Amino acid sequence: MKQLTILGSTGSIGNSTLSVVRANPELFKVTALVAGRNVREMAQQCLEFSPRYAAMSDEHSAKSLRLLLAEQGSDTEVYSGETAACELAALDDVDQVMAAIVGIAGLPSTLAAIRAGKQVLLANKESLITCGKLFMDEVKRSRAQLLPIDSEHNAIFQSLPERIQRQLGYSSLNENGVSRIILTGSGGPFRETPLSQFSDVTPDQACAGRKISVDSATMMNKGLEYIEARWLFNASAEQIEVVLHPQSVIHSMVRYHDGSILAQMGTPDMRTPIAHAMAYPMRVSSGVAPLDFCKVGALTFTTPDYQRYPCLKLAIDACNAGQAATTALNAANEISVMAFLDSKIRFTDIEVINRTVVEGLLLSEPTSVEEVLVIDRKARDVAAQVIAKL
Amino acid sequence: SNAMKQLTILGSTGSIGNSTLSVVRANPELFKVTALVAGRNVREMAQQCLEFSPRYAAMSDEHSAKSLRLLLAEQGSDTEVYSGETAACELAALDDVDQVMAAIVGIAGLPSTLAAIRAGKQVLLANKESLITCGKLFMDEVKRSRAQLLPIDSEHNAIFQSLPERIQRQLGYSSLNENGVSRIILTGSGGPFRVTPISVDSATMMNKGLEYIEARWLFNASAEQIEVVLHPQSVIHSMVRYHDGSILAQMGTPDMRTPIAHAMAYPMRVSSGVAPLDFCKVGALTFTTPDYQRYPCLKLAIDACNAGQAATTALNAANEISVMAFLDSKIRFTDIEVINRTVVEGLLLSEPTSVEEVLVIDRKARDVAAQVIAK
Numbered sequence: 069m070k071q072l073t074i075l076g077s078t079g080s081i082g083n084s085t086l087s088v089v090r091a092n093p094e095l096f097k098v099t100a101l102v103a104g105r106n107v108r109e110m111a112q113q114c115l116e117f118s119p120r121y122a123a124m125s126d127e128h129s130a131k132s133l134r135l136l137l138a139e140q141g142s143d144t145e146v147y148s149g150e151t152a153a154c155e156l157a158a159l160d161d162v163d164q165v166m167a168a169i170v171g172i173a174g175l176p177s178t179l180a181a182i183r184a185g186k187q188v189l190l191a192n193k194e195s196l197i198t199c200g201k202l203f204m205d206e207v208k209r210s211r212a213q214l215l216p217i218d219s220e221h222n223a224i225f226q227s228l229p230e231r232i233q234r235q236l237g238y239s240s241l242n243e244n245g246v247s248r249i250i251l252t253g254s255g256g257p258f259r260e261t262p263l264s265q266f267s268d269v270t271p272d273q274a275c276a277g278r279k280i281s282v283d284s285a286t287m288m289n290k291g292l293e294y295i296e297a298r299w300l301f302n303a304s305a306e307q308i309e310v311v312l313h314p315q316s317v318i319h320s321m322v323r324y325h326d327g328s329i330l331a332q333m334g335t336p337d338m339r340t341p342i343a344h345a346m347a348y349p350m351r352v353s354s355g356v357a358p359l360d361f362c363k364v365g366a367l368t369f370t371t372p373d374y375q376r377y378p379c380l381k382l383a384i385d386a387c388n389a390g391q392a393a394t395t396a397l398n399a400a401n402e403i404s405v406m407a408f409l410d411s412k413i414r415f416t417d418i419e420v421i422n423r424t425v426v427e428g429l430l431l432s433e434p435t436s437v438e439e440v441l442v443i444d445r446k447a448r449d450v451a452a453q454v455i456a457k458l
Numbered sequence: 459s460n461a462m463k464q465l466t467i468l469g470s471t472g473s474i475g476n477s478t479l480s481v482v483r484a485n486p487e488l489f490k491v492t493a494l495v496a497g498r499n500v501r502e503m504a505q506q507c508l509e510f511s512p513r514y515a516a517m518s519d520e521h522s523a524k525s526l527r528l529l530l531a532e533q534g535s536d537t538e539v540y541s542g543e544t545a546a547c548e549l550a551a552l553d554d555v556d557q558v559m560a561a562i563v564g565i566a567g568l569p570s571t572l573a574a575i576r577a578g579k580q581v582l583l584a585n586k587e588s589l590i591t592c593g594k595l596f597m598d599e600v601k602r603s604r605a606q607l608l609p610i611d612s613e614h615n616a617i618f619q620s621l622p623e624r625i626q627r628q629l630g631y632s633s634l635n636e637n638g639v640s641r642i643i644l645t646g647s648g649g650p651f652r653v654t655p656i657s658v659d660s661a662t663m664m665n666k667g668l669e670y671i672e673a674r675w676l677f678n679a680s681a682e683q684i685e686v687v688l689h690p691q692s693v694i695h696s697m698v699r700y701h702d703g704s705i706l707a708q709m710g711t712p713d714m715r716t717p718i719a720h721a722m723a724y725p726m727r728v729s730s731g732v733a734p735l736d737f738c739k740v741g742a743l744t745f746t747t748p749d750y751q752r753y754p755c756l757k758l759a760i761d762a763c764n765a766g767q768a769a770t771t772a773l774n775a776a777n778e779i780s781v782m783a784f785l786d787s788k789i790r791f792t793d794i795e796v797i798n799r800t801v802v803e804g805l806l807l808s809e810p811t812s813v814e815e816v817l818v819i820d821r822k823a824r825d826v827a828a829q830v831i832a833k
């Protein structure tokens with residue numbers, strides 16, 4: 069049966085993943101567990117799932133965890149640091165690796181797994197927003213099998229032909245029958261709000277994560293998912309479109325050459341795409357009532373409008389210009405968001421900041437993690453500046 | 459192209475037949491026409507023969523096959539003409555032909571369609587009666603000759619596309635349940651009255667029940683693994699539920715060249731001039747379960763399917779008579795289910811075990827429904 073390393077096990081995706089394991093003890097076996105500094109959640113996982121190894125980001129968290137398990141007499145071996153996380157993402161006997169360590173701290177361990185030809189269930193985003201090129205190159209080299217976990221990408225993946233699914237990110241969409249990918253998204257809260265009221269939007273009105281809420285209103289969440297999808301499904305600009313779909317019943321679609329469209333639907337539960345990806349090409353259960361069609365309201369769709377969602381276009385143009393542009397935009401969006409979250413700026417200022425930073429770009433494309441981290445820090449700064457200067 | 463597939467097209471003068479030739483027109487490097495077969499439309503076949511330069515061509519009788527060979531000669535055609543059921547079946551079984559479009563209408567379509575299956579071909583299945591009349595035998599032949607069955611009806615084509623490749627490649631003799639599939643969702647508009655004089659069948663929703671029957675056999679489904687669901691707008695063409703909550707659906711426009719080109723290119727895809735769906739032009743999309751009181755026939759379709767081919771074979775045949783009558787201002791729209799149920803439950807039957815046997819039940823039930831009408 070199947071052997072797992074779970075990178076980022078103590079957090080939200082980490083735990084849904086373990087839940088799929090808890091409900092299919094016969095199919096999935098936990099070999100390695102990695103997390104940051106949550107000893108307590110890590111110990112209780114290590115006792116329940118009895119891995120061979122575990123790692124924490126630093127030595128102090130390791131020492132703690134090592135003691136707690138030593139009191140319970142578990143055999144689990146405990147390590148620390150980026151190298152250990154990399155070596156647990158690369159063990160020869162592990163079949164499947166969950167890359168669910170958030171943010172740019174996650175990239176190293178994700179890459180090791182990609183490098184070891186593993187089935188990698190990709191939860192980390194930055195990977196592709198900032199250095200999709202390096203990652204997808206590595207994927208080709210290793211014939212590593214990527215499986216997206218985000219519901220939208222997962223939707224696409226299920227909607228894609230097996231042919232492409234098994235060669236994810238280096239199959240040629242056109243040759244294999246695909247005309248276009250349809251990334252769907254709701255519009256956020258301000259979808260039928262009159263543009264006059266955009267300038268006056270506030271944090272409480274946006275958020276009632278905190279930051280994901282803002283992104284979904286500007287549709288930065290969908291711009292970034294668009295970039296992710298270009299690298300991920302090996303898709304050019306003409307091969308992917310975005311449609312608005314307020315009810316979010318349909319998680320995404322795929323257009324084929326004869327006209328056929330294949331879409332995935334479901335409720336929005338975590339486990340469902342996580343287990344799709346874990347069992348693939350099998351399938352298992354997970355609790356949640358199947359969708360009911362008498363319950364769901366009507367479904368509607370629109371093309372998004374760039375006057376309402378300028379950030380989207382921005383994301384698209386940034387992709388077309390390169391990894392420097394996206395890296396920059398991502399980082400400057402993180403600054404803009406938590407600036408509007410502190411009321412330093414208006415909601416409509418987010419585009420302007422995001423745009424200025426990106427149109428003052430004059431760097432080379434990054435060819436590693438390292439060069440990314442540089443661009444990420446400088447864009448932050450420039451953005452940081454831009455906030456102040458109005 | 460060296461990847462040219464060769465086609466035999468049976469029913470090539472009808473609407474499905476013509477839709478099939480359009481898809482060949484758009485991709486003249488990937489589909490070669492080797493045999494065209496039709497009924498009595500001598501003119502239409504002559505054009506297609508001339509347009510497409512087949513090797514062979516057949517019609518249902520020799521008078522038809524005579525006139526067409528004169529029209530072939532005057533234009534100077536190499537196309538060898540035959541007639542009769544035996545010619546059709548041999549054309550449907552040629553060695554170098556890869557694909558066979560089985561688009562003859564009515565019970566007449568069975569011999570040729572069975573030939574194709576028995577010859578192991580990739581069979582593009584239009585004919586409803588095949589699966590409706592003899593599900594058992596046809597799937598038994600599909601199993602044994604390993605033909606690739608490719609449903610052309612939109613609903614069924616929707617479902618094929620929403621299923622795992624593993625079921626697709628083994629269509630009919632594979633296990634849904636072991637391939638992650640929990641249920642198949644047959645969708646349909648539910649007709650205008652969702653009555654004064656294909657129109658009626660979709661009204662009483664027999665068209666749907668019959669599609670139901672077809673779908674149980676096609677996909678190897680128990681009644682448990684199939685749910686019917688109304689979807690007025692007909693944008694989603696049908697769906698599949700997976701064990702993990704996932705649902706897959708196919709959508710598109712009413713243009714039939716979409717599923718026919720899916721079928722022809724399988725496992726690959728081709729363009730076919732179809733205007734792709736536009737979500738700006740689709741309004742809201744709604745879903746309600748069916749009302750068996752509003753569609754008595756649906757419930758009847760189910761019961762018939764659970765009883766066996768004898769019963770379902772009965773129903774179809776009954777309905778043909780029962781409908782034709784309503785439209786000839788002879789009985790009332792509301793009667794159609796009552797006639798049809800009376801018939802199906804009035805016969806003492808044996809499960810058929812050949813086309814021949816099947817056909818006798820078709821005549822019998824027809825005669826009976828006629829009598830019930832007199833009353």
Ligand SMILES: NC(=O)C1=CN([C@@H]2O[C@H](COP(=O)(O)OP(=O)(O)OC[C@H]3O[C@@H](n4cnc5c(N)ncnc54)[C@H](OP(=O)(O)O)[C@@H]3O)[C@@H](O)[C@H]2O)C=CC1
Pocket residue numbers: 075076077078079080081082102103104105106107124125153167168169170171173174191192193217218219338
């Ligand atoms: N939440 C969601 O619905 C979705 C999330 N994602 C992505 O999945 C990833 C995980 O998201 P989520 O589960 O919400 O994240 P959480 O913040 O819940 O957890 C992050 C996990 O990563 C661990 N971690 C952080 N830094 C390090 C490090 N240096 N070394 C080892 N472990 C580390 C944290 O450990 P600890 O807490 O023990 O320190 C924690 O276990 C993210 O990249 C996110 O974008 C993608 C799609 C959907």
Ligand SMILES: NC(=O)C1=CN([C@@H]2O[C@H](COP(=O)(O)OP(=O)(O)OC[C@H]3O[C@@H](n4cnc5c(N)ncnc54)[C@H](OP(=O)(O)O)[C@@H]3O)[C@@H](O)[C@H]2O)C=CC1
Pocket residue numbers: 468469470471472473474475495496497498499500517518560561562563564566584585586587610611612
């Ligand atoms: N149209 C649709 O939307 C759909 C149709 N189908 C089914 O597919 C089949 C074909 O439909 P469609 O093409 O519209 O039907 P049509 O009524 O247009 O024509 C049927 C074809 O069969 C031919 N034909 C009839 N009897 C014979 C015979 N004894 N030998 C040879 N050819 C014969 C006719 O030839 P000629 O006219 O030259 O005599 C004609 O080309 C039917 O079973 C139909 O129910 C399935 C799904 C959708």
